[PDB]
Amino acid sequence: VSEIKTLVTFFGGTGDLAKRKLYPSVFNLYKKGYLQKHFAIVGTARQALNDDEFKQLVRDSIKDFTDDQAQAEAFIEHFSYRAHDVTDAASYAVLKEAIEEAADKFDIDGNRIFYMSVAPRFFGTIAKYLKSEGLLADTGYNRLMIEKPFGTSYDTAAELQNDLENAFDDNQLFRIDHYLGKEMVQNIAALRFGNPIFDAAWNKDYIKNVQVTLCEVLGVEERAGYYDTAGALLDMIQNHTMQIVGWLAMEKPESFTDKDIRAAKNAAFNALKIYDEAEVNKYFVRAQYGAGDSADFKPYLEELDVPADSKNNTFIAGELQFDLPRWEGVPFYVRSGKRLAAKQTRVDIVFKAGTFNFGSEQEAQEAVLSIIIDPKGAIELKLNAKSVEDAFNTRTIDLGWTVSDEDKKNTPEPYERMIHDTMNGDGSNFADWNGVSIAWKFVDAISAVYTADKAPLETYKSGSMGPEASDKLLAANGDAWVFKG
Amino acid sequence: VSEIKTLVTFFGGTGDLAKRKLYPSVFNLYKKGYLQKHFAIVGTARQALNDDEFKQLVRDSIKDFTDDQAQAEAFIEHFSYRAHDVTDAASYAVLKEAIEEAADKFDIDGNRIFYMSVAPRFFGTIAKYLKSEGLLADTGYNRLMIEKPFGTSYDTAAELQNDLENAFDDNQLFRIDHYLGKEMVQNIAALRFGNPIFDAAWNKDYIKNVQVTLCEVLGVEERAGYYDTAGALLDMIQNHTMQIVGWLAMEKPESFTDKDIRAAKNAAFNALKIYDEAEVNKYFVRAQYGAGDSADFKPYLEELDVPADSKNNTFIAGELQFDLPRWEGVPFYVRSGKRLAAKQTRVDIVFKAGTFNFGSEQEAQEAVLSIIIDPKGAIELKLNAKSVEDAFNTRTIDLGWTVSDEDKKNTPEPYERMIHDTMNGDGSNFADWNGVSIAWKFVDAISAVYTADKAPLETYKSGSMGPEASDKLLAANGDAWVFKG
Ligand SMILES: NC(=O)c1ccc[n+]([C@@H]2O[C@H](COP(=O)([O-])OP(=O)(O)OC[C@H]3O[C@@H](n4cnc5c(N)ncnc54)[C@H](O)[C@@H]3O)[C@@H](O)[C@H]2O)c1
Ligand SMILES: NC(=O)c1ccc[n+]([C@@H]2O[C@H](COP(=O)([O-])OP(=O)(O)OC[C@H]3O[C@@H](n4cnc5c(N)ncnc54)[C@H](O)[C@@H]3O)[C@@H](O)[C@H]2O)c1
Numbered sequence: 001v002s003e004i005k006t007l008v009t010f011f012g013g014t015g016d017l018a019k020r021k022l023y024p025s026v027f028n029l030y031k032k033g034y035l036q037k038h039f040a041i042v043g044t045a046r047q048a049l050n051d052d053e054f055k056q057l058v059r060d061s062i063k064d065f066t067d068d069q070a071q072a073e074a075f076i077e078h079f080s081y082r083a084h085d086v087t088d089a090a091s092y093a094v095l096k097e098a099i100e101e102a103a104d105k106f107d108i109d110g111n112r113i114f115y116m117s118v119a120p121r122f123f124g125t126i127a128k129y130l131k132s133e134g135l136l137a138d139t140g141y142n143r144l145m146i147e148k149p150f151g152t153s154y155d156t157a158a159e160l161q162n163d164l165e166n167a168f169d170d171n172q173l174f175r176i177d178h179y180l181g182k183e184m185v186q187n188i189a190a191l192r193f194g195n196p197i198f199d200a201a202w203n204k205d206y207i208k209n210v211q212v213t214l215c216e217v218l219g220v221e222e223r224a225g226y227y228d229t230a231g232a233l234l235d236m237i238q239n240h241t242m243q244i245v246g247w248l249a250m251e252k253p254e255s256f257t258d259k260d261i262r263a264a265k266n267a268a269f270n271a272l273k274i275y276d277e278a279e280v281n282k283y284f285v286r287a288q289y290g291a292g293d294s295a296d297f298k299p300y301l302e303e304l305d306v307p308a309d310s311k312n313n314t315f316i317a318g319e320l321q322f323d324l325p326r327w328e329g330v331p332f333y334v335r336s337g338k339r340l341a342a343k344q345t346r347v348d349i350v351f352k353a354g355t356f357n358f359g360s361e362q363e364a365q366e367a368v369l370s371i372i373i374d375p376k377g378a379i380e381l382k383l384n385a386k387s388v389e390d391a392f393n394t395r396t397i398d399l400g401w402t403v404s405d406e407d408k409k410n411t412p413e414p415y416e417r418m419i420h421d422t423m424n425g426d427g428s429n430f431a432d433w434n435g436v437s438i439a440w441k442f443v444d445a446i447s448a449v450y451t452a453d454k455a456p457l458e459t460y461k462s463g464s465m466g467p468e469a470s471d472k473l474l475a476a477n478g479d480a481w482v483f484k485g
Numbered sequence: 486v487s488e489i490k491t492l493v494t495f496f497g498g499t500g501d502l503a504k505r506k507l508y509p510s511v512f513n514l515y516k517k518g519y520l521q522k523h524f525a526i527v528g529t530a531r532q533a534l535n536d537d538e539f540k541q542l543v544r545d546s547i548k549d550f551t552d553d554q555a556q557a558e559a560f561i562e563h564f565s566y567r568a569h570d571v572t573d574a575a576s577y578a579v580l581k582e583a584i585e586e587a588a589d590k591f592d593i594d595g596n597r598i599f600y601m602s603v604a605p606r607f608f609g610t611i612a613k614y615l616k617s618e619g620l621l622a623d624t625g626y627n628r629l630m631i632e633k634p635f636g637t638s639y640d641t642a643a644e645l646q647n648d649l650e651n652a653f654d655d656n657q658l659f660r661i662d663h664y665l666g667k668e669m670v671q672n673i674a675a676l677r678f679g680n681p682i683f684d685a686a687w688n689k690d691y692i693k694n695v696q697v698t699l700c701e702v703l704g705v706e707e708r709a710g711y712y713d714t715a716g717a718l719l720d721m722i723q724n725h726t727m728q729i730v731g732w733l734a735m736e737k738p739e740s741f742t743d744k745d746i747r748a749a750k751n752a753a754f755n756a757l758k759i760y761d762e763a764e765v766n767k768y769f770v771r772a773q774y775g776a777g778d779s780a781d782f783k784p785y786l787e788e789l790d791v792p793a794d795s796k797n798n799t800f801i802a803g804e805l806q807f808d809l810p811r812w813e814g815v816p817f818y819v820r821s822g823k824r825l826a827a828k829q830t831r832v833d834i835v836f837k838a839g840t841f842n843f844g845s846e847q848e849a850q851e852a853v854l855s856i857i858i859d860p861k862g863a864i865e866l867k868l869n870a871k872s873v874e875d876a877f878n879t880r881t882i883d884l885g886w887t888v889s890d891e892d893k894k895n896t897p898e899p900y901e902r903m904i905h906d907t908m909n910g911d912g913s914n915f916a917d918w919n920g921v922s923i924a925w926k927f928v929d930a931i932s933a934v935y936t937a938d939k940a941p942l943e944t945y946k947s948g949s950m951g952p953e954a955s956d957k958l959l960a961a962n963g964d965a966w967v968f969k970g
Contacts, residue, residue, distance in 0.1 A: 194869030
């Protein structure tokens with residue numbers, strides 16, 4: 001197959017994500033023959049692990065998924081290491097030598113990718129030095145992969161963006177959003193624009209409400225430290241949920257390129273309504289988990305590292321509105337929570353009921369197109385049909401599909417995908433600045449009301465599907481959740 | 486449940502259909518509590534089997550599906566018999582006594598149904614005498630159930646209709662069409678008008694071609710006598726196929742009553758194009774089966790009772806055209822044959838491919854909604870989605886549904902249904918004169934070309950899906966059969 005000529009620099013190349021997913025993903029791209037010879041990987045961090053120590057380190061990350069050891073060694077020989085502090089301007093001149101050397105060794109003409117697997121605060125600095133100290137490639141491309149998260153509010157994200165803008169244009173930036181790399185999420189566009197019946201039905205005339213759900217049965221566990229300040233609202237909503245909602249609410253693009261897709265999504269984001277205090281209390285719900293039945297399921301306030309007066313939200317549910325002609329009056333419901341009934345990520349599109357009367361006992365109900373992302377991809381379609389009774393009557397049936405074993409084994413892990421797209425230079429599966437800015441602006445208005453404590457904090461027995469308020473939020477518009485454990 | 490007060494007269498009450506399906510169906514309506522007391526069944530034929538002999542006869546038909554024998558006896562006691570020749574005008578006065586007596590015995594105020602399970606030629610006579618000799622009920626209703634077939638051409642069907650019109654209005658007539666009583670066929674309307682996405686897509690803008698298939702793996706066997714003169718063209722096409730095509734091509738009714746449904750179907754039938762000689766040769770295909778591989782599968786011309794110079798068609802395939810705005814240019818393909826690959830009755834709706842380009846290797850294909858009627862009800866929906874590859878690419882997947890065991894056991898057998906609808910007076914599931922007249926007119930133009938031998942007779946190896954000409958007929962419009970064994 002075609003060879004990818006690139007040189008990748010991993011800032012924080014000895015960390016968890018690095019040796020647990022980054023390195024393995026890069027190995028798969030080698031196994032599939034995409035990376036052959038003209039490529040090199042330059043690890044970097046503070047430790048002065050020498051060139052022999054690094055190789056062993058990588059051999060352990062790509063350990064479990066290798067069988068021909070000779071294949072492993074030949075790959076590992078494309079790695080090099082250099083000790084380096086990201087704040088020290090001169091240290092960069094040392095890195096530049098490691099990079100300019102690896103390039104020469106494998107005749108790599110430019111094409112550099114800088115992966116930042118470091119603390120959020122260092123993002124601005126590294127960007128600044130890459131350009132000033134001359135680590136940027138004179139030929140080919142220069143791309144930056146920014147790890148999560150991108151800011152903690154609109155103000156901070158704006159700062160980050162402005163710093164990055166000094167050296168890179170927005171299209172050269174690749175913010176890593178885990179969920180946007182999931183196979184099933186990339187099917188939403190295929191189903192919609194690939195089948196005219198849905199394509200033409202994707203609007204206010206045929207849909208009654210769209211629902212998005214991010215479920216987790218696990219509690220906070222040892223993640224309490226950071227989680228207590230972020231909560232579901234920033235952990236799952238602001239990033240993952242909004243970017244999935246983006247694929248759903250987007251306009252129909254003039255073409256299927258990153259440029260046009262982004263233009264199509266931004267049209268919806270720019271129509272997203274921002275809430276004031278009253279609206280936040282009417283359209284959103286925040287809750288926190290109590291006890292289940294089992295002592296195994298302890299209340300949030302009894303978890304380790306959790307303050308006994310914490311108002312952190314472990315569950316969020318709300319109604320989004322898009323002031324666009326195609327979405328006039330169509331509610332978009334989202335929900336994310338911990339200690340819920342099950343682990344699952346899915347989209348449920350509820351179509352409007354038909355007005356055609358059969359004179360039957362049970363008249364036509366609402367059809368539903370469910371796209372299941374996690375744990376395993378599935379697509380269900382609930383339709384109206386005839387019941388098996390003597391008198392004519394309707395019922396609903398579910399047509400179903402599921403990913404095959406062959407499909408599941410060939411499915412490219414999210415990181416492998418994101419890394420591969422970046423080498424190709426395809427922002428189709430990445431959130432753009434415009435998208436992120438609006439998402440922050442939207443979430444900030446909610447957080448303002450929470451930090452000020454101007455909304456109640458609901459509670460819910462662990463293992464449930466959330467507080468009653470979740471149901472009442474939908475009941476208000478004559479709606480209800482399709483999924484319920 | 487509500488009780489059905491009726492008195493049914495079975496002309497030919499000792500025949501096959503009578504004791505093999507008619508009687509059992511009537512027993513089920515008793516088991517389900519619909520028929521309780523104010524009802525009676527008057528058998529009739531030429532044999533003078535006395536009132537005790539008849540009861541035993543019925544006890545054998547409802548034999549295998551009875552367990553509480555006391556339930557059986559109480560039912561059987563509502564039957565009476567009378568010897569009677571249908572040509573003898575005075576014999577009717579004898580029948581009138583059997584009927585007027587049974588009515589008195591169970592206080593049945595009118596509501597009479599006359600089932601004609603006699604030879605086609607007797608239909609006109611019985612109708613005539615029922616009215617003149619006064620067997621018709623003065624109160625309630627008087628309905629006639631006409632068994633298959635209704636005419637053998639337009640001329641003969643017109644004769645029959647005119648004779649029947651002398652005593653009954655068209656709405657009081659109930660022509661028995663086996664296939665129109667099948668559960669799955671009655672689902673076609675539920676799926677279409679019950680789900681706006683299909684409802685709005687049911688036209689020339691979204692569908693590329695509709696396909697209907699009636700398959701049989703069995704040969705002619707001992708049915709050769711009659712079959713050699715009728716063939717597939719009249720055996721399966723004229724009746725079964727056209728009436729299913731009626732449900733598919735129908736307009737959207739102003740309501741869901743028999744009157745409006747029929748008005749909706751007739752709009753399509755009245756737009757059906759009738760072919761001349763050239764068109765018959767371009768749009769239709771007739772074939773006859775040869776040998777398979779196994780001696781078990783003998784050529785048609787070697788079957789018992791088959792003339793060694795017979796040009797009888799054992800397979801028919803053709804393109805129907807509806808000159809209606811909603812069907813402008815949408816081909817309707819039908820096919821019926823013996824000794825084909827499998828036994829199956831199904832409808833395949835092929836939607837047009839999308840014009841949206843993904844720049845992918847495989848661009849969007851045609852979606853397909855398959856409704857499987859026989860052997861067991863199923864609904865499949867082929868849609869475009871994303872393939873599990875590194876580069877973005879589309880593929881097709883099938884969402885599936887199947888009838889459950891509970892559904893299959895509760896499914897009311899076609900005859901039970903037809904008989905039940907007639908007692909209710911619902912022509913929704915029956916073909917009306919207008920529908921039949923056009924079907925005959927359509928088929929006659931084809932037969933004229935066949936009897937004149939102005940079209941070739943194709944051949945096909947038994948077990949196949951038909952002659953190559955079947956494929957070429959669809960290839961011409963850039964189409965192909967969805968099902969293929
Ligand atoms: N918490 C979340 O929501 C979340 C979830 C998933 C992924 N992530 C990301 O996972 C990544 C975690 O990183 P990790 O697992 O690779 O490891 P890590 O935290 O252990 O440290 C990674 C590297 O940083 C280097 N380092 C530390 N300080 C340095 C400095 N002052 N100068 C130079 N190098 C320095 C260390 O030497 C090490 O090699 C982060 O980028 C985080 O954003 C975040
Ligand atoms: N061939 C097909 O395509 C087809 C398929 C399915 C059903 N059918 C129908 O099945 C039915 C078959 O009838 P059957 O199975 O009940 O039995 P059958 O042919 O044995 O005879 C039925 C009754 O007709 C009576 N009979 C005959 N001549 C009579 C006369 N001159 N006067 C009065 N009574 C007379 C006999 O006594 C008997 O009781 C037919 O109505 C046929 O149309 C046709």
